[PDB]
Design a protein around this ligand. Structure first.
Ligand SMILES: O=c1cc(O)n([C@@H]2O[C@H](COP(=O)(O)O)[C@@H](O)[C@H]2O)c(=O)[nH]1
Ligand SMILES: O=c1cc(O)n([C@@H]2O[C@H](COP(=O)(O)O)[C@@H](O)[C@H]2O)c(=O)[nH]1
Ligand code: PRO
Ligand code: PRO
Ligand code: PRO
Ligand code: PRO
Lengths: 256, 256
């Protein structure tokens, strides 16, 4: 297994993946904050304070009550300052002709500020082809949702294999996966895993949690995505540090 | 087979489905306009002119460059005047805790103006449970995506069956399907079919077209969803009338 820093140099690495892997190695973090808040001020205060602890900040722009493109300008300033990527977890999942407009346009102009987006594979490869028309010229990357953390997920077996094939056939734009585990044997692909908490359990709407040690160390993923385990804690900085140290040590132990 | 007007009276009918079926019968239309435009003025001018010809107007609010909640107030005025439902084709597809916020909140406040939304079933039933927390109190309905019109769709076989079971187990909120065909034998459920044009073909991003006669008459669906076949035509009113007459006659011929 190569280190994150060595994977950043792989011949077929995507530039967005390379940038991410280099800052993960530099900062000793494989934590993605899931900034699931409704106030711009809270989003930005979290991004500033937790920026040094994270490799990535994941947004849901469509829950932000006071969204403006100026909020996103300020978030980019923090991402550049503290060195993390912005991942809009939009889960594009329509026909190619529709998703290109949803990615470039409307109020959110997602492609203008998001380093990474993601897509469901269920609609077939046209979803990727439509997003790539906007994202390739803008030097962006995309993650495919190969496995989901929720109870009753149908993203198993042949579905997961289809996601891996779609990614591997669109490597110009697709840089990895949302998954619960390593799903590709190709080290150029990232694996990002949500459904992570230090304690066992779930929520009352189908979320299921596994620990950083389980998903990084045993299941072979690269990055943990953590929302409520950090955002519901009183001291979100120390919570982020706990998650960072857990994910980083699990990675080091698996690298050996 | 019961008429639309008789299905509107079925004991287990959802109120939103009943309202829709009654106005379909009254107006002799089973056409849903896919209003895939980026200008509010064009959206509203289409809704006004085509309102008498349609049972439903399908939106993608996230491609509207000049979205405001006031645009949606004006769209509701037209929907009430001309008697059609508003369907936001948001394709919710996240964990339950996330989709409830995406449905109620953010800039779009979708639940405040959309009679209908839809969801992908891949994340498991938590997607429906989260949307129902917001939609049931607001008297809304939801469609589940059981089949997709795009090339490479993975919404086949066991996936389609899982969508039908999920709908049938959440009938308080789920009123039907996006599908290419009749997928449920229960007449309380609606079937809405996109990927429709009078002429054969597709697009260059995986869209595939079938005719109104095929999807209503042979495949047993209830409603056709038509975008470019109407919106790219010069005279969008006469195009809508052609599609309305095609879908309505195919329905009458199958009812016999
Ligand atoms: O499989 C997936 C994919 C996701 O994007 N997510 C997202 O990751 C976050 C999980 O948040 P939390 O840690 O609070 O449960 C949410 O923003 C959710 O939308 C997920 O939980 N499971
Ligand atoms: O299976 C599906 C589901 C959809 O919502 N759609 C939507 O229906 C519309 C199809 O538009 P058109 O008729 O221009 O191809 C688009 O808005 C698309 O997002 C689809 O085409 N196929
Ligand atoms: O599931 C378990 O037992 C352990 C306890 C903490 C998280 N994983
Ligand atoms: O299962 C639960 O309810 C709590 C909160 C998530 C971790 N343990
Ligand atoms: O596919 C076909 O042959 C016919 C021609 C018009 C639409 N259906
Ligand atoms: O296939 C095509 O390109 C045209 C446009 C849709 C119907 N026929």
């Amino acid at each position: 297994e190569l280190s994150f820093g060595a994977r950043a140099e792989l011949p077929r690495i995507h530039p967005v993946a390379s940038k991410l892997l280099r800052l993960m190695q530099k900062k000793e973090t494989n934590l993605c904050l899931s900034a699931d808040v409704s106030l711009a001020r809270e989003l930005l205060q979290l991004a500033d304070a937790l920026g040094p602890s994270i490799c990535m900040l994941k947004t849901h722009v469509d829950i932000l009550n006071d969204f403006t493109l100026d909020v996103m300008k300020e978030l980019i300033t923090l991402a550049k300052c503290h060195e993390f990527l912005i991942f809009e977890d939009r889960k594009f999942a329509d026909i190619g002709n529709t998703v290109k407009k949803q990615y470039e346009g409307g109020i959110f102009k997602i492609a203008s500020w998001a380093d990474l987006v993601n897509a469901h594979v269920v609609p077939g490869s046209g979803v990727v082809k439509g997003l790539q028309e906007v994202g390739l010229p803008l030097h962006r990357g995309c993650l495919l949702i190969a496995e989901m953390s929720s109870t009753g997920s149908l993203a198993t077996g042949d579905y997961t294999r289809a996601a891996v094939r779609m990614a591997e056939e669109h490597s110009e734009f697709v840089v990895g996966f949302i998954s619960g585990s390593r799903v590709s044997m190709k080290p150029e692909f990232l694996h990002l895993t949500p459904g992570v908490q230090l304690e066992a359990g779930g929520d009352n709407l189908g979320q299921q949690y596994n620990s950083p040690q389980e998903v990084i160390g045993k299941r072979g993923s690269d990055i943990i995505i953590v929302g409520r385990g950090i955002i519901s804690a009183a001291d979100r900085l120390e919570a982020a540090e706990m998650y960072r140290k857990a994910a980083w040590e699990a990675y080091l132990s698996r690298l050996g």
